[PDB]
Amino acid sequence: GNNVVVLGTQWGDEGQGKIVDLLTERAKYVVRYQGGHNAGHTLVINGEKTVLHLIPSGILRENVTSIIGNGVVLSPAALMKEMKELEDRGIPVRERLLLSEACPLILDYHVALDNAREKARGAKAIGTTGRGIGPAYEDKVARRGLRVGDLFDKETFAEKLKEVMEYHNFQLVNYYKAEAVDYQKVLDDTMAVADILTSMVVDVSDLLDQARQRGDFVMFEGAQGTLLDIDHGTYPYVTSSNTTAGGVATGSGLGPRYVDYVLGILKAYSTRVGAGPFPTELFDETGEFLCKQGNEFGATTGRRRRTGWLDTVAVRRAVQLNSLSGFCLTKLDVLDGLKEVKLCVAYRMPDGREVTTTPLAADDWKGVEPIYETMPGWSESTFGVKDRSGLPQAALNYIKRIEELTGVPIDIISTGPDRTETMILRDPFDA
Amino acid sequence: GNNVVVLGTQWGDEGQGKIVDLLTERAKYVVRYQGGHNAGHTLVINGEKTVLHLIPSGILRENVTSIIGNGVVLSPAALMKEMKELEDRGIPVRERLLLSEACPLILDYHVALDNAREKARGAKAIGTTGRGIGPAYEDKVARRGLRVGDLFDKETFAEKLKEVMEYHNFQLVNYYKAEAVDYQKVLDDTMAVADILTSMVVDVSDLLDQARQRGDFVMFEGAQGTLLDIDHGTYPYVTSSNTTAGGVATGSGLGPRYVDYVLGILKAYSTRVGAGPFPTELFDETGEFLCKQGNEFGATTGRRRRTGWLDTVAVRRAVQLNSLSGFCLTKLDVLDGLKEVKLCVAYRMPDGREVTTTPLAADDWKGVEPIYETMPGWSESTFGVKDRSGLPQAALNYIKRIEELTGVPIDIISTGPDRTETMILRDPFDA
Ligand SMILES: Nc1nc2c(ncn2[C@@H]2O[C@H](COP(=O)(O)OP(=O)(O)O)[C@@H](O)[C@H]2O)c(=O)[nH]1
Numbered sequence: 057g058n059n060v061v062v063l064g065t066q067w068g069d070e071g072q073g074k075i076v077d078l079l080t081e082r083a084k085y086v087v088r089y090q091g092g093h094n095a096g097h098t099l100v101i102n103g104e105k106t107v108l109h110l111i112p113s114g115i116l117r118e119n120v121t122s123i124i125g126n127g128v129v130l131s132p133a134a135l136m137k138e139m140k141e142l143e144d145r146g147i148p149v150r151e152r153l154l155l156s157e158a159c160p161l162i163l164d165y166h167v168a169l170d171n172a173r174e175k176a177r178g179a180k181a182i183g184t185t186g187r188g189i190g191p192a193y194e195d196k197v198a199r200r201g202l203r204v205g206d207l208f209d210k211e212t213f214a215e216k217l218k219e220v221m222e223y224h225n226f227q228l229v230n231y232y233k234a235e236a237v238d239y240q241k242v243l244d245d246t247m248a249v250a251d252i253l254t255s256m257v258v259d260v261s262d263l264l265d266q267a268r269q270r271g272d273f274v275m276f277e278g279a280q281g282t283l284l285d286i287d288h289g290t291y292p293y294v295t296s297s298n299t300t301a302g303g304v305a306t307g308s309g310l311g312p313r314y315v316d317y318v319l320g321i322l323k324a325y326s327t328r329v330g331a332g333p334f335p336t337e338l339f340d341e342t343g344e345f346l347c348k349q350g351n352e353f354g355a356t357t358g359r360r361r362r363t364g365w366l367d368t369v370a371v372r373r374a375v376q377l378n379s380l381s382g383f384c385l386t387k388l389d390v391l392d393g394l395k396e397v398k399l400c401v402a403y404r405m406p407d408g409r410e411v412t413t414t415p416l417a418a419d420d421w422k423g424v425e426p427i428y429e430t431m432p433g434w435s436e437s438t439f440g441v442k443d444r445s446g447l448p449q450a451a452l453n454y455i456k457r458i459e460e461l462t463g464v465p466i467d468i469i470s471t472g473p474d475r476t477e478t479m480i481l482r483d484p485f486d487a
Numbered sequence: 488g489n490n491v492v493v494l495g496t497q498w499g500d501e502g503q504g505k506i507v508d509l510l511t512e513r514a515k516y517v518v519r520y521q522g523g524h525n526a527g528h529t530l531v532i533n534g535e536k537t538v539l540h541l542i543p544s545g546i547l548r549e550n551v552t553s554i555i556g557n558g559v560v561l562s563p564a565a566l567m568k569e570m571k572e573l574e575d576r577g578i579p580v581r582e583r584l585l586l587s588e589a590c591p592l593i594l595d596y597h598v599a600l601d602n603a604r605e606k607a608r609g610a611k612a613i614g615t616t617g618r619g620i621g622p623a624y625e626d627k628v629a630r631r632g633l634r635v636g637d638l639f640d641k642e643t644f645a646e647k648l649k650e651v652m653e654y655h656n657f658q659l660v661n662y663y664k665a666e667a668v669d670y671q672k673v674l675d676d677t678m679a680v681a682d683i684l685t686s687m688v689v690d691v692s693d694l695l696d697q698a699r700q701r702g703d704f705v706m707f708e709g710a711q712g713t714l715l716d717i718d719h720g721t722y723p724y725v726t727s728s729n730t731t732a733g734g735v736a737t738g739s740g741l742g743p744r745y746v747d748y749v750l751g752i753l754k755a756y757s758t759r760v761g762a763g764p765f766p767t768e769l770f771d772e773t774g775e776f777l778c779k780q781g782n783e784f785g786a787t788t789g790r791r792r793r794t795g796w797l798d799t800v801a802v803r804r805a806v807q808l809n810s811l812s813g814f815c816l817t818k819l820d821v822l823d824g825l826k827e828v829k830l831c832v833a834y835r836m837p838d839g840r841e842v843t844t845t846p847l848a849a850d851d852w853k854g855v856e857p858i859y860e861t862m863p864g865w866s867e868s869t870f871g872v873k874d875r876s877g878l879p880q881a882a883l884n885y886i887k888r889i890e891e892l893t894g895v896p897i898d899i900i901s902t903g904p905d906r907t908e909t910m911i912l913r914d915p916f917d918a
Pocket residue numbers: 064068069070071072073074095096097098099100350351354355386387388389390470471472473
């Protein structure tokens with residue numbers, strides 16, 4: 057298909073970055089449609105590592121035009137920091153990147169609010185990335201937030217920012233009893249970059265309608281994972297945007313009937329960073345092995361990632377929510393050297409009923425237990441293998457099993473962080 | 488197609504209700520996926536009028552199961568009022584309606600906030616429907632809002648509501664200097680209905696995945712119109728949800744690749760209620776004629792609707808944003824007896840450039856002028872006509888012209904408020 061969607065089928069960090077950088081080789085565009093700089097996607101080319109937060113993952117291919125879509129909450133400061141960092145490395149960011157005037161802006165006060173709210177929650181802290189994600193989304197939805205388009209008239213912007221900050225500062229000092237964020241300070245910082253931001257504005261929806269008509273290859277880059285979806289995730293332990301496939305159209309302007317293939321990135325075992333239900337979570341040596349071998353530390357907060365076994369019950373909710381066309385099984389190599397590997401095929405509800413469907417809000421997961429299928433592991437190193445032939449039968453079985461349980465074909469398998477340690481069994485762009 | 492989407496291509500009130508009630512005749516389900524009780528859809532059967540707000544439009548057909556999807560912001564009070572009203576009229580609401588445990592709840596404090604914010608905006612008041620729509624969406628996105636699922640444990644709900652209301656009451660009295668909303672009062676009112684709400688909960692995403700697999704006919708009912716979309720509309724003069732087609736998946740849980748046909752409801756002339764750009768707006772006698780003949784008063788606030796000429800430039804933004812498959816031209820009969828009728832084919836930008844594309848945020852519409860094509864009107868009454876044969880050539884030309892300008896076929900034409908005063912040239916369910 058022409059329009060391919062790449063998203064995390066779990067709770068983020070499944071390996072979308074690597075997969076976007078890899079498939080973009082034939083793409084004209086790459087579009088981020090939700091989230092902000094809470095994401096942290098690692099590209100590794102010939103050993104050279106790049107971690108992107110807000111900048112789309114096609115940024116290293118000069119043949120691709122990177123687009124930050126309207127669904128994205130955009131921090132000017134964040135953008136500037138990543139730009140300078142990539143430019144210093146020879147990546148002419150300003151020539152490859154475009155953005156939406158409809159993108160809300162994340163300013164220092166959103167960070168102050170996120171921290172305050174997080175503090176206020178005490179024991180029940182969501183465990184957010186400390187960027188002002190949610191607050192920026194609140195402002196958007198309240199219709200008081202500033203957007204990239206507002207920079208098109210600095211005087212009027214200055215007026216708008218004053219009103220908003222006075223509003224939020226009132227709450228910050230009187231209610232949370234936190235320090236106020238300085239108006240002038242934010243105003244100045246933002247104006248210093250305005251012209252750069254503004255210089256990259258394109259009408260994204262019209263642009264994508266044109267690409268679509270030309271049959272151009274487009275890639276949509278997800279952020280976070282399905283179970284972190286504001287609507288369908290383990291609420292309130294979630295991110296504030298829709299991480300599921302419908303977010304592709306809300307956050308880019310492309311008509312929903314133009315999605316041709318939805319590629320769901322699937323890790324091979326599970327990880328979650330932040331508070332929240334996690335049925336297959338492991339607190340034993342194997343959990344520790346998982347973290348270790350898979351270097352599971354948040355590419356944005358550096359926080360350690362909780363690890364567990366692949367949960368086919370949760371993954372099946374992702375299948376239906378996102379109309380998966382296929383999966384990209386990632387981090388298989390990490391399972392190398394395990395006597396056995398298991399996957400969750402059902403959930404035992406606290407009331408005794410066996411179920412193969414997941415609960416919705418976090419509280420409804422309270423006493424659910426995972427029911428497993430334990431399969432043989434494999435001692436052979438599968439790292440960097442680019443051919444199924446090079447995978448042991450235990451590895452292939454685990455693979456067939458997952459397809460069986462989900463009803464979705466594993467079209468791509470990743471065996472290491474490098475762009476090329478992968479086997480593409482079927483290229484989404486050809487399907 | 489099996490999954491058909493019906494939405495307003497303008498700024499709401501295009502006539503979605505009538506169209507949903509009509510096409511649902513062959514449908515198993517009807518799903519609202521965004522908005523709340525700000526909508527006001529008028530069904531008219533054999534002269535008998537029904538105005539729905541939160542309850543889906545298939546509610547009068549016992550063969551259809553009505554579903555309030557997760558994208559919808561749900562007011563328990565609002566639901567109860569409409570239920571009692573429809574039940575008194577013989578419509579066994581509780582048997583035909585189902586809802587999502589993921590739907591946020593709109594409580595009295597959201598109304599108090601909406602009014603406060605609206606007051607605070609002074610001259611720049613959005614002109615909202617006075618329901619707590621935006622505030623309920625803010626709470627959702629902030630992850631502090633209550634949802635239908637929270638009612639599954641009344642003690643814990645009571646705890647949660649206390650925290651939230653204390654938070655909002657603080658803002659209401661200290662900052663807006665408005666009266667506080669009573670905790671106990673809201674708690675009691677909400678608990679009185681809890682069991683009823685809770686009794687209608689179904690897992691909507693899984694339900695729709697099952698319908699889809701059975702090839703069941705499903706209809707998705709839009710609320711508001713494209714230009715009121717939180718992301719793509721004339722921001723901030725908008726509603727807080729995505730009214731565009733991507734909202735179908737975010738607000739129902741159905742995979743975006745399962746939308747088969749998107750039917751865009753198109754009024755024949757334009758109307759807008761609430762503040763906001765409106766290029767083709769008429770302040771003359773013809774504008775007055777439009778309001779009058781088309782009884783243009785908000786079916787929810789009773790406020791008068793601003794009227795103007797059909798704007799093909801704005802409609803073309805809706806074509807691309809929603810991947811329209813076809814249109815339903817409504818209220819043609821209203822144009823009866825006009826020497827001429829015109830439609831906007833382009834916009835003159837304040838800088839002199841001619842454009843056929845629309846600006847995004849409200850401010851970017853500031854001095855845009857509409858450029859028209861003036862066509863002959865028709866004196867013949869087209870009211871209640873169910874055959875193109877019964878339309879005069881001037882009416883048919885106007886029709887061909889619109890298709891020409893948009894590149895989208897007008898599959899259905901409505902000629903009066905009654906369910907049957909319509910011509911279906913092509914049934915979305917068959918395409
Ligand atoms: N060993 C191994 N590491 C991988 C593989 N694919 C990706 N990685 C690495 O795993 C991590 C993925 O985490 P993150 O970058 O936060 O995921 P993302 O946000 O979805 O892109 C990074 O460390 C990648 O370099 C793979 O197949 N094998």
